[PDB]
Amino acid sequence: HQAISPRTLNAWVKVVEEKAFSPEVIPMFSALSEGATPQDLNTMLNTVGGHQAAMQMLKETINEEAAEWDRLHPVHMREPRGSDIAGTTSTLQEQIGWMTHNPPIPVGEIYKRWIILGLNKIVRMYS
Structure with missing residues (x-):
């Protein structure tokens, strides 16, 4: 594990500062979030100034x-719930746990895809 680099973080900041929600924000996010944990992805989203809508x-x-994830994955290391993938009810160690398991559950890659789905919808909003 390494926390997302500050360089990565600062690039994401200047990207959003400068492009707001132009469609180019999406490939930039994807490049800058490679191999990220859910916690890292939330750090990235939370450094975004403003844009509250x-x-x-x-x-x-x-x-x-x-x-939708929860509808297809009923309960019973615990298996992650949707909120665990989004990093709001899971710890960093738990996220690393899932991502390095055999078999792995790539919670970072799942959450990144959910975020990209949201960013596509925002892009439809600024348009």
């Missing part, structure tokens, strides 16, 4: 994908 639409998308 955009951030609200993103959270609603995340919450829908999490509920």
